[PDB]
């Protein structure tokens, strides 16, 4: 059975978790507590990973690393990456555009001067969010009436930037609906209420923002 | 004839440029000089891109942005991303690990505190390069006997980390090789010697590392 290894935190894997519940696929999680970093440094080179790292996916003669390939994989198995070249780049482009947000957040999340940085960030956030609203205009999801993995990716971003600035989505009623809509999906809804859900932390614990054991 | 738009620097599009030249695929470039940041903002939105940004690829209403979605597209348009979930995900994992090196460079390159940050990057670098030296054991190119896009990514990364530290590869002669090998491919080699080759800068002209109009 599938194995998904990562820190007991949202981070770089949340989308993959949410995409997994959607496909109601069975998988076993391997999470590393805040103080268990040695446990990782021990097994790190004893898993058969050609590029050791976190997260890692292992479900047979396949042992992956890199949150994208891992997720791109889970989806590619259920033919969710696109039927033709063009479309597959459309979804890879959504993939990218979302990361510039989610990663844009972790560039300044561990910095001690996170407060001074967040300004320019949230200053440029509107423009980015705007593109998605446009994309979502006349679509149930980023790619149409069918849930694509970048959706859980965008969903993850949104939720993260709401903790940073809960007002950022007021200017975008559409993105707020999107989020609600995603949460509506039966599987998703059972996850967010299930005991496997990981509401916090967002980033690793040592992080200024989104770090720490309990939300601020 | 397709169009590739970007700054006249190696930056995020070098791999892609190689690939294109590798498949002798014809195309034209829209090169933005150092002092043309306006000309871009002038056309940023009059191109019909759903996520205005750089670099951009455009041909018959195939409008793309995000260096990864782009490169993968050219690759996919030639059946080079993989023949199945497993080999496709393997190629994505290579993508990831290569960026974890190429990007590592750029995130500490624009900092004014570069000269002391590179020190901690170069210390970690070995462990990263190593993984690639292994992958290249009993293989001609990553992922096999046939050239893939991640091979052009690692090549750019290599070429860039050698400027930062001329001796980073001495402990990995297998990479020094892989690099000469790529440069040996007739199309590639003919390119590097061509006028279309952008030798410098590596990053945005403003960058501390690999910036400036000419290399030091």
Curated annotation (Swiss-Prot), chains A, B:
Keyword Plastid: no
Keyword annotations from UniProtKB, A to Z: Transferase
GO terms for biological process, alphabetical: glutathione metabolic process
MF annotations from Gene Ontology: glutathione transferase activity
Record domain GST N-terminal: where: 1-82
EC number: 2.5.1.18
EC category name: transferase
Keyword Ion transport tagged: no
Database matches in Pfam families: GST_C_3 (PF14497), GST_N (PF02798)
Function field: Conjugation of reduced glutathione to a wide number of exogenous and endogenous hydrophobic electrophiles. GST isoenzymes appear to play a central role in the parasite detoxification system. Other functions are also suspected including a role in increasing the solubility of haematin in the parasite gut.
Entries under PANTHER family matching the protein: GLUTATHIONE S-TRANSFERASE (PTHR11571), GLUTATHIONE TRANSFERASE (PTHR11571:SF222)
Protein's name in the database: Glutathione S-transferase class-mu 26 kDa isozyme
Native organism: Schistosoma japonicum (Blood fluke)
């Amino acid at each position: 059975s599938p194995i998904l290894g990562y820190w007991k935190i949202k981070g770089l894997v949340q989308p993959t978790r949410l995409l997994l519940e959607y496909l109601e696929e069975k998988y076993e999680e391997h999470l590393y507590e805040r103080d268990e970093g040695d446990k990782w440094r021990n097994k790190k080179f004893e898993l058969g990973l050609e590029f050791p790292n976190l997260p890692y996916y292992i479900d047979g003669d396949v042992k992956l690393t890199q949150s994208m390939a891992i997720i791109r994989y889970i989806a590619d198995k259920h033919n969710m990456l696109g039927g033709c070249p063009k479309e597959r780049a459309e979804i890879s482009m959504l993939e990218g555009a979302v990361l510039d947000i989610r990663y844009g957040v972790s560039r300044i999340a561990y910095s001690k001067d996170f407060e001074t940085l967040k300004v320019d960030f949230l200053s440029k956030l509107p423009e980015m969010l705007k593109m998605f609203e446009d994309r979502l205009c006349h679509k149930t999801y980023l790619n149409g009436d069918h849930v694509t993995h970048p959706d859980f990716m965008l969903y993850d971003a949104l939720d993260v930037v709401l903790y940073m600035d809960p007002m950022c989505l007021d200017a975008f009623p559409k993105l707020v609906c999107f989020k609600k809509r995603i949460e509506a999906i039966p599987q998703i809804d059972k996850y967010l209420k299930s005991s496997k859900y990981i509401a916090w932390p967002l980033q690793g614990w040592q992080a200024t923002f989104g770090g720490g054991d309990h939300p601020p």
